[PDB]
Amino acid sequence: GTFTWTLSDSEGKDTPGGYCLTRWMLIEAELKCFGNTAVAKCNEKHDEEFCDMLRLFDFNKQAIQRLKAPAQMSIQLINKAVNALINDQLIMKNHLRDIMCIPYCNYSKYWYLNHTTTGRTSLPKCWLVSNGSYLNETHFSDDIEQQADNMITE
Amino acid sequence: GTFTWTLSDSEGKDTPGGYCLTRWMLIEAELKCFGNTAVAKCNEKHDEEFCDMLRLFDFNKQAIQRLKAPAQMSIQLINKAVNALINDQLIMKNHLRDIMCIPYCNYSKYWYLNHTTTGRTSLPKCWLVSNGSYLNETHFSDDIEQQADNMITE
Amino acid sequence: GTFTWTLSDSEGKDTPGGYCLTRWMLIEAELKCFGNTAVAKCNEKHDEEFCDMLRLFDFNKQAIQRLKAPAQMSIQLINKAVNALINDQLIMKNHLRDIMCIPYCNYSKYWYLNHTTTGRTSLPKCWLVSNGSYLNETHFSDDIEQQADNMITE
Amino acid sequence: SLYKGVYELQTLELNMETLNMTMPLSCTKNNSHHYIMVGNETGLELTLTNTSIINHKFCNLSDAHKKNLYDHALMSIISTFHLSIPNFNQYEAMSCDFNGGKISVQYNLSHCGTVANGVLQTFMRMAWGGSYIALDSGCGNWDCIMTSYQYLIIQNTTWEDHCQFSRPSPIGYLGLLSQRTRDIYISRRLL
Amino acid sequence: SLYKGVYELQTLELNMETLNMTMPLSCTKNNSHHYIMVGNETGLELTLTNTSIINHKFCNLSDAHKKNLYDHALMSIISTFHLSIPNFNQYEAMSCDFNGGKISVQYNLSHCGTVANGVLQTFMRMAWGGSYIALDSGCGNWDCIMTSYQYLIIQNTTWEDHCQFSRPSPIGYLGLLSQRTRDIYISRRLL
Amino acid sequence: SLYKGVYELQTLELNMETLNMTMPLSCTKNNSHHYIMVGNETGLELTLTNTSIINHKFCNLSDAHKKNLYDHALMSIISTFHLSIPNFNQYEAMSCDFNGGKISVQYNLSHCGTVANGVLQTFMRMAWGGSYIALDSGCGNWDCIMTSYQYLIIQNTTWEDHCQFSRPSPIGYLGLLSQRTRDIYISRRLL
Ligand SMILES: *[C@@H]1O[C@H](CO)[C@@H](O[C@@H]2O[C@H](CO)[C@@H](O[C@@H]3O[C@H](CO[C@H]4O[C@H](CO)[C@@H](O)[C@H](O)[C@@H]4O)[C@@H](O)[C@H](O[C@H]4O[C@H](CO)[C@@H](O)[C@H](O)[C@@H]4O[C@H]4O[C@H](CO)[C@@H](O)[C@H](O)[C@@H]4O)[C@@H]3O)[C@H](O)[C@H]2NC(C)=O)[C@H](O)[C@H]1NC(C)=O
Ligand SMILES: *[C@@H]1O[C@H](CO)[C@@H](O[C@@H]2O[C@H](CO)[C@@H](O[C@@H]3O[C@H](CO)[C@@H](O)[C@H](O[C@H]4O[C@H](CO)[C@@H](O)[C@H](O)[C@@H]4O)[C@@H]3O)[C@H](O)[C@H]2NC(C)=O)[C@H](O)[C@H]1NC(C)=O
Ligand SMILES: *[C@@H]1O[C@H](CO)[C@@H](O[C@@H]2O[C@H](CO)[C@@H](O[C@@H]3O[C@H](CO)[C@@H](O)[C@H](O[C@H]4O[C@H](CO)[C@@H](O)[C@H](O)[C@@H]4O)[C@@H]3O)[C@H](O)[C@H]2NC(C)=O)[C@H](O)[C@H]1NC(C)=O
Ligand SMILES: *[C@@H]1O[C@H](CO)[C@@H](O[C@@H]2O[C@H](CO)[C@@H](O[C@@H]3O[C@H](CO)[C@@H](O)[C@H](O[C@H]4O[C@H](CO)[C@@H](O)[C@H](O)[C@@H]4O)[C@@H]3O)[C@H](O)[C@H]2NC(C)=O)[C@H](O)[C@H]1NC(C)=O
Ligand SMILES: *[C@@H]1O[C@H](CO)[C@@H](O[C@@H]2O[C@H](CO)[C@@H](O[C@@H]3O[C@H](CO)[C@@H](O)[C@H](O)[C@@H]3O)[C@H](O)[C@H]2NC(C)=O)[C@H](O)[C@H]1NC(C)=O
Ligand SMILES: *[C@@H]1O[C@H](CO)[C@@H](O[C@@H]2O[C@H](CO)[C@@H](O)[C@H](O)[C@H]2NC(C)=O)[C@H](O)[C@H]1NC(C)=O
Ligand SMILES: *[C@@H]1O[C@H](CO)[C@@H](O[C@@H]2O[C@H](CO)[C@@H](O)[C@H](O)[C@H]2NC(C)=O)[C@H](O)[C@H]1NC(C)=O
Ligand SMILES: *[C@@H]1O[C@H](CO)[C@@H](O[C@@H]2O[C@H](CO)[C@@H](O)[C@H](O)[C@H]2NC(C)=O)[C@H](O)[C@H]1NC(C)=O
Ligand SMILES: *[C@@H]1O[C@H](CO)[C@@H](O[C@@H]2O[C@H](CO)[C@@H](O)[C@H](O)[C@H]2NC(C)=O)[C@H](O)[C@H]1NC(C)=O
Ligand SMILES: *[C@@H]1O[C@H](CO)[C@@H](O[C@@H]2O[C@H](CO)[C@@H](O)[C@H](O)[C@H]2NC(C)=O)[C@H](O)[C@H]1NC(C)=O
Ligand SMILES: *[C@@H]1O[C@H](CO)[C@@H](O[C@@H]2O[C@H](CO)[C@@H](O)[C@H](O)[C@H]2NC(C)=O)[C@H](O)[C@H]1NC(C)=O
Ligand SMILES: *[C@@H]1O[C@H](CO)[C@@H](O[C@@H]2O[C@H](CO)[C@@H](O)[C@H](O)[C@H]2NC(C)=O)[C@H](O)[C@H]1NC(C)=O
Ligand SMILES: *[C@@H]1O[C@H](CO)[C@@H](O[C@@H]2O[C@H](CO)[C@@H](O)[C@H](O)[C@H]2NC(C)=O)[C@H](O)[C@H]1NC(C)=O
Ligand SMILES: *[C@@H]1O[C@H](CO)[C@@H](O[C@@H]2O[C@H](CO)[C@@H](O)[C@H](O)[C@H]2NC(C)=O)[C@H](O)[C@H]1NC(C)=O
Ligand SMILES: *[C@@H]1O[C@H](CO)[C@@H](O[C@@H]2O[C@H](CO)[C@@H](O)[C@H](O)[C@H]2NC(C)=O)[C@H](O)[C@H]1NC(C)=O
Ligand SMILES: *[C@@H]1O[C@H](CO)[C@@H](O)[C@H](O)[C@H]1NC(C)=O
Ligand SMILES: *[C@@H]1O[C@H](CO)[C@@H](O)[C@H](O)[C@H]1NC(C)=O
Ligand SMILES: *[C@@H]1O[C@H](CO)[C@@H](O)[C@H](O)[C@H]1NC(C)=O
Ligand SMILES: *[C@@H]1O[C@H](CO)[C@@H](O)[C@H](O)[C@H]1NC(C)=O
Ligand SMILES: *[C@@H]1O[C@H](CO)[C@@H](O)[C@H](O)[C@H]1NC(C)=O
Ligand SMILES: *[C@@H]1O[C@H](CO)[C@@H](O)[C@H](O)[C@H]1NC(C)=O
Ligand SMILES: *[C@@H]1O[C@H](CO)[C@@H](O)[C@H](O)[C@H]1NC(C)=O
After folding, report:
1. What S-S linkages are listed for this chain (chains D, E, F)?
2. How far is C-alpha B76 from the geometric centre of its chain's CA atoms?
3. Phi/psi at E164 (5° precision)
């Protein structure tokens, strides 16, 4: 009924929490680490695409490591375990926004605010698409303002 | 998984994030608007029938507005989109309460508090029934008192 | 959807809330009452096995009390009602942690802190198992310390 | 009614007729007749009755599917209803007639742990608004649910102001959408 | 065992025996025998064994449904078990005998990516607590788990104190309810 | 771009091709050819075309299951696709051929209530990354979705760098897993 998979990237960090996307998990980018204050929101938020993608990447990493691979690959594991990693109704929302000509998240690009001197970051939010065109950073500038206010509150 | 559909009603309002039920969505009543503080609770809580109904009405409005109508009506859209709008296990709880002779919500009638001078309101809670009879406003007067005690702290 | 079943063990108590595991719901035949503060977290959190078990035990009590037993047993009521009582994807998480040689909850044993003088207790958390042996308390002592910090905070 | 001196209690009643275009809405007229309107101009009528309309034991769904001729929404509702029946194992209990594209299903409800019990259980969830007056007890009984009526007849019909006893609601159908294929028995090694 | 001076660590263990009146309870006696108790009366015995009992390739589910001599809860458990098998495509692997209302199902397990792996895959989840000893490895191997036994036999049985290795728990059964029909192959163009 | 004087807007793009060892990934080359990749070395090519490769109306799923010469992940994807079609009732519309273990399915798409709409709805969700260019209208039509192409042909293929128009993504397939058997019609009284 609800995702339950927990992220674990505590080794070698200054805080037990947080999660890091390596250069293999990212397109034309280096290592990117997000702290506990942002990643901890994924435990509760039910409408964040980035959190679902983090659970997918973490599950993939632990699955290729801790389970013996068969000779020819099977998709049984994800077929059972998808509902513990992601909210499929979030994908349904993005599909509904797509067919109704509303901007929607295709699960590729995300944006976040990074503090200049501290390095603290927000939980990334998805960059929306309409007919193959990304939004132009002015279509949701007030959301960016609200996110900056949220981090200033913290 | 979990509901994700978001309500969109901000034009002409003193603040964004509220939602307004028009005269057509109500039995023998006029337009009624609920502020951002009450409607925003629908994004988190999982046991409010009124929030499910708001998402249903909003989805109906958007579907009639934005999607081309077929020649003959088809229910494929709701059959695909229902789990993103409502908690079907809330319906299951209400039906379980019905068969167990416990008061249950039939999703028809709701009650809210309304401050006389400021006009601020709580999120409407469902008025329960049992064998066709509504509760008589004394069966849950302590719930109303607790709800009133919750708004004074805000 | 997500779980919605509400616990009701308020009569005769000091405060309107909490839940009591009676002598028959526990090994070693003891009565264990948990206050409103601990049990109230079951309404929100989606990753607590103990809360799912509380909903199962309460549903068993209510179903035995309020529904006429058939002459031959039927498992028809639990089949429909399971998704309103438990998060099946929490069971999926524990199965996934089982098959990857990670410690997992089998839903049998739980641990909680208990204040010496006030009698206040936390929400019980599951005692994990790996292979055929329970974990020592030293394997998760930092979690116990964090729970003690959380109780001191409130 | 004022609480804390400043908070007045006020009430709502939602008009779910406006949801007719996007979702099926179910309601009750009286004890025997119940309805599921699919928008306007079409719907299903569920009657608990002692008068049978089908005297044979055929349900030629394959021929109906080949010919089409039926409203796809109504057949979807029938499929949801049938797949929501738990532990259905008597094929002669259900007979059908889809000649000319119509829909006409008949469940023979002729005490505990029977096909009539499961059919009545799905019936009262498909029409959850006002079905409780139709059943013998209406409460405290799930597994041994029963009705004096011998047949449940589901027929396609036209839109009229049927909702006399209970208001229209999509809640029953939307609830039953998750119950599909959850309690169906296996009839083959390969489904 | 005190933490922060005043907080004492304490533990509880749930007695899930009391859930027998509402739901199945699955648990393990030894590596070769597992059980799914329904009520204080009935249930299923699941044995991994090298000894056949059916010795033919028939599974007459339709005739059993016609006669209706079986326990509906046990057949529901059997249907959930079969529909939870991922990628089942060899009907000959499953044999059945429902003569007189009994239940006697047999899966032929006679390395990676075939029907025996799927049968064991559903078996170790249907009795989650304590089925790990029955397999070659408790963990590390998932996509092809194996056991030396050649047959899995599911038979209706009466109630007895069977769990000597693991406590009764509904979690194994309740987990598989959502797994039904998620990995079944299509056998017909109209299902 | 600085907000509030000190907060710099920054972006990241996820490389979901690294998810290939655990789940399928869907992408689009051009408006007609779309791909599903199950790891490396295998996958399905979904092609909208006016050229049919199957002239018969057989599909013979049971024989393919009995011989068991096919890739199980690809057949699982085909089963998910077919069971995700809403209101499929024309069995002659879908032909297929699994001789020798290959996979080759052909949906006959030859404007609101036909099987072509349901097939296209499932198609544009299985390949959600770039299927909008494959349709007559990018958005605003769901019940009356159409394409000028007359056939949708799904054939097993090898891995190459096809993902030209849209990036690889598992989102479509993972979304359609909950859609299996949700909008199917009943063909037999006992499923
Ligand atoms: C959307 O994206 C798809 C996928 O990329 C794309 O499909 C491809 O289209 C191209 C162009 O139509 C196809 O290219 C032709 O394919 C044939 C078939 O051979 C292929 O397959 C065999 C195995 O079955 C392979 O062994 C072989 O190497 C090819 O991969 C080829 O025969 C064609 O080559 C000949 O014609 C070319 C001109 O098109 C010549 O340049 C080439 O030298 C070859 O000459 C031959 O043909 C001459 C007559 O034309 C003849 O006189 C010569 O004697 C000689 O026989 C060519 O490669 C390709 O197969 C398609 N691939 C797939 C996966 O479908 C769509 O076209 C694209 N659509 C859009 C909107 O752009
Ligand atoms: C939830 O529970 C409540 C309380 O049990 C329930 O309220 C009842 O609903 C019915 C149906 O609307 C009401 O019956 C109506 O009563 C008026 C009295 O003036 C009649 O005029 C109505 O009949 C006319 O209108 C109908 C609808 O258009 C026509 O079909 C009919 O031919 C007439 O023109 C109708 O009989 C009943 O009064 C209320 N009772 C209470 C206490 O409010 C509600 O329906 C339930 N809702 C759901 C979603 O199930
Ligand atoms: C969760 O994991 C734990 C740890 O692995 C696991 O605990 C084990 O449970 C089994 C089953 O109860 C215990 O085995 C018991 O051990 C005592 C030893 O004195 C025996 O007396 C018990 O046998 C008697 O009772 C049985 C049940 O009525 C009878 O069938 C039998 O004939 C005897 O009368 C029984 O063998 C085992 O001791 C614990 N081990 C630990 C480490 O605690 C627990 O079962 C798992 N739970 C679930 C839900 O899977
Ligand atoms: C989500 O929406 C965005 C925006 O619509 C969308 O971004 C587009 O993705 C495609 C696919 O990656 C990009 O196409 C690439 O463009 C570059 C331009 O230089 C080409 O070089 C690429 O082709 C090379 O690599 C391919 C394999 O990746 C090879 O097959 C090919 O032969 C070449 O070697 C490729 O065409 C496109 O540029 C972006 N556009 C934008 C605006 O960023 C994204 O794909 C969508 N994601 C999902 C999951 O749907
Ligand atoms: C619905 O189901 C009931 C049974 O549950 C059907 O009634 C049964 O009908 C058969 C005939 O088809 C009856 O058998 C007959 O019994 C009489 C008297 O013994 C005998 O003279 C006849 O030769 C024949 O054997 C059976 O008794 C009767 N049972 C009941 C409970 O009435 C009913 O026909 C079904 N209705 C439909 C429309 O399918
Ligand atoms: C079905 O719902 C529609 C939409 O809510 C109703 O149509 C509305 O009817 C009112 C009253 O006549 C009009 O003022 C609105 O403009 C209509 N809206 C639209 C979008 O058409 C319709 O009345 C309902 N049908 C039935 C039979 O109850
Ligand atoms: C419930 O309402 C229906 C519909 O009005 C009643 O059936 C009608 O009964 C009258 C009187 O016999 C007939 O003239 C009509 O043709 C019937 N209509 C239909 C659609 O069948 C039915 O009798 C009512 N039930 C009860 C128990 O009062
Ligand atoms: C049930 O559906 C059938 C088939 O659509 C209806 O019969 C059709 O009625 C229309 C007019 O509404 C005629 O033009 C068609 O020729 C009829 N078809 C056949 C095959 O006779 C029937 O009226 C519906 N039933 C009810 C009670 O409304
Ligand atoms: C099945 O569970 C029921 C309770 O749901 C158990 O019955 C209880 O047994 C204890 C011990 O004898 C009694 O004190 C209780 O009063 C009984 N409760 C009820 C409601 O009858 C029963 O023992 C369990 N069965 C098995 C085989 O363990
Ligand atoms: C697991 O336990 C069962 C019974 O508890 C054992 O099977 C029994 O074997 C004895 C000795 O041959 C027979 O008399 C009984 O009839 C058998 N019982 C049943 C139910 O089959 C079985 O051998 C045990 N397995 C192991 C490995 O110890
Ligand atoms: C279970 O399956 C095995 C493997 O197919 C069957 O054993 C085969 O039986 C045939 C027919 O007698 C022999 O020709 C093969 O040599 C056997 N193969 C092996 C590997 O032993 C076995 O008969 C099946 N069991 C049942 C009860 O049907
Ligand atoms: C499995 O079920 C069958 C059928 O119910 C049981 O056999 C029946 O047992 C009852 C008494 O419990 C007798 O009255 C019936 O006559 C028996 N039927 C037949 C066809 O023989 C059987 O005992 C059960 N198996 C076990 C191991 O308990
Ligand atoms: C499929 O995913 C795997 C796993 O992420 C990718 O393999 C990685 O490839 C990179 C670049 O060669 C290596 O640095 C990693 O060490 C590899 N990891 C593993 C576990 O093999 C693989 O590249 C992906 N497939 C494709 C076609 O890109
Ligand atoms: C689709 O699958 C078939 C069957 O696996 C592939 O054909 C096989 O190819 C292998 C080598 O890769 C040969 O050893 C087999 O003999 C072939 N079988 C048959 C029946 O021809 C086929 O190559 C795949 N299609 C594509 C386009 O790659
Ligand atoms: C796909 O379906 C079309 C019809 O929708 C078939 O074309 C028809 O073929 C018949 C003879 O079989 C002709 O009488 C019709 O005139 C054709 N109709 C059209 C519109 O062309 C076509 O054969 C089917 N294709 C396959 C491969 O089965
Ligand atoms: C944020 O900015 C700092 C600037 O030094 C950089 O080091 C860090 O990697 C950035 N973090 C993220 C998540 O982009
Ligand atoms: C906590 O401690 C008190 C006193 O030791 C005891 O009465 C109570 O039962 C304990 N808590 C629980 C929930 O068992
Ligand atoms: C589990 O414990 C047993 C001893 O009881 C041991 O033989 C076995 O190797 C263990 N399995 C694993 C996976 O460690
Ligand atoms: C737990 O600690 C005890 C000593 O207190 C030790 O004997 C035992 O082996 C430990 N268990 C595990 C599973 O490490
Ligand atoms: C179903 O088909 C059979 C074929 O023999 C036919 O006799 C019967 O009349 C058909 N039933 C209906 C209701 O049309
Ligand atoms: C596919 O990937 C595997 C590792 O997962 C590698 O051994 C194999 O060579 C690859 N095959 C191709 C054709 O790239
Ligand atoms: C999408 O963009 C293309 C141009 O790239 C345009 O031709 C098409 O009309 C657009 N579609 C929609 C739905 O706006």
Report:
1. 27-163, 59-96, 112-144
2. 23
3. -110, -15
Put the strands of the sheet holding E42-49 in their side by side order. E25-30, E33-38, E42-49, E151-158, E104-108, E94-96
The beta-strand segments (E) located in F1-71 are: 2-3, 7-13, 24-28, 33-38, 43-49
Ligand nearest to the CA of D164: 2
Of the candidates E59, E75, E191, which has its C-beta nearest D189's C-beta?
E59
The answer to whether residue C109 sits within a structural domain is: yes
Method: cryo-EM
Q: What DSSP element (H or E) covers B62?
A: helix B49-66
For residue D154, which amino acid is it? I
For E95-112, letters b (16+ CB in 10 Å) and e give bbbbeeeebebbbbbeee
Number of domains in chain B: 1
**Option in D87, D144, D179 nearest C68 (CB):** D144
- The experimental resolution of this structure, in angstroms, equals 2.8
Q: Do chains C and B touch (3 or more CB pairs under 8 A)?
A: yes
Task: Using a CB–CB cutoff of 8 Å, tell me whether F99 touches chain A.
Answer: no
Structure tokens at C141: 């002592």
Subunit contact E128:C95, Cβ cutoff 8 A:
yes
Q: Which residue of A has its CA nearest to E86?
A: A76
Element (H, E) at E119: helix E115-126
| A127-143 burial: b if 16+ Cβ within 10 Å, else e | bbbbeeeeeeeeebeee
- Domain residues for the domain of B139 are 19-152
**A54 contacts A41 by C-beta, under 8 angstroms:** no
Q: Is residue B3 part of a domain?
A: no
- Listed by the residue before each break, gaps in chain A with C–N over 2.5 Å are none
Give the residues across from E47 on adjacent strands: E33, E153
Distance CA E97, CA E109 (A): 18
Q: Which residues in chain D have Cβ-Cβ distances shorter than 8 Å to C84? A: none
Phi first, then psi: give them for residue E2, nearest 5 degrees. -100, 140
Total residue length of chain A: 154
